[PDB]
Paper text:
The effector protein YfiN (also known as TpbB or PA1120) is an integral inner membrane protein that functions as a diguanylate cyclase, consisting of a periplasmic PAS domain, a cytoplasmic HAMP domain and a catalytic GGDEF domain. The third component of the YfiBNR signalling system, YfiR, has a key role in the signal transduction process by bridging YfiN in the inner membrane and YfiB in the outer membrane. YfiB can release the repression of YfiN by sequestering YfiR at the outer membrane, which requires both membrane anchoring and peptidoglycan binding by YfiB for full activity.
Crystal structures of the periplasmic domain of YfiB were determined for two different constructs: from residues 27–168 to 1.58 Å resolution, and from residues 59–168 to 1.39 Å resolution. The YfiB(59–168) construct also excludes the region from residues 35–55 linked to increased membrane attachment. The longer YfiB construct crystallizes with two molecules in an asymmetric unit while the shorter construct crystallizes with only one molecule per asymmetric unit. Analytical ultracentrifugation data confirms that YfiB(27–168) predominantly forms a dimer in solution, while YfiB(59–168) is exclusively a monomer. The YfiB(59–168) structure lacks helix α1’ and strand β1’ and has a considerably shorter β1 strand than its larger counterpart, but otherwise retains the same core domain. The two structures can be superimposed with an r.m.s.d. of 1.3 Å for 105 aligned residues. The largest structural differences occur at the N-terminus, which dissociates from the β-sheet in YfiB(59–168), and in the β2-α2 loop, which packs against helix α3 in the shorter structure but is directed away from α3 in the longer structure. Strand β1’ and helix α1’ includes residues that are proposed to form a linker region that unfolds to facilitate membrane attachment and YfiR sequestration.
Numbering used by the authors: 61 to 170
The structure:
Amino acid sequence: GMSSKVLFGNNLDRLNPDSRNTLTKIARALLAVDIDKVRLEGHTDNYGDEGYNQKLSERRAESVAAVFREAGMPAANIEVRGLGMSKPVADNKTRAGRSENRRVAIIVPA
C-alpha cells in the first residue's frame, strides 16, 4: 500500500478508493508527527507534447494534494508542482517504463 510513488493509468489523473485511503493514512501520519511540509510532484510519460503533459502532471499532483488537504494538512504547507514529461525515472521506450513515469512523487523536504 504505502509508497512515496503514486501511479496513474495512461492519460488518467484520478485516484481510486484504495489509493485515496492509503494516501489519507500517509497524510494523517505526517499530521500526527507535526511535519511542516509536503511537496507533491506530478509527472508523465513522453507521449504527447510538452504542454499536454505539463497540464496532465498538474492534474495528477492536484488529485494527491486534495487528499492531503481533506486529511487536515493546510494548503499553505503543501507545495504542488507539475513537471510534465521532463524528469522520467523509467524507460519511455517501453510500456512498463512509461507506466512507472505516470506518477506523483510525495516528498517531505528537509
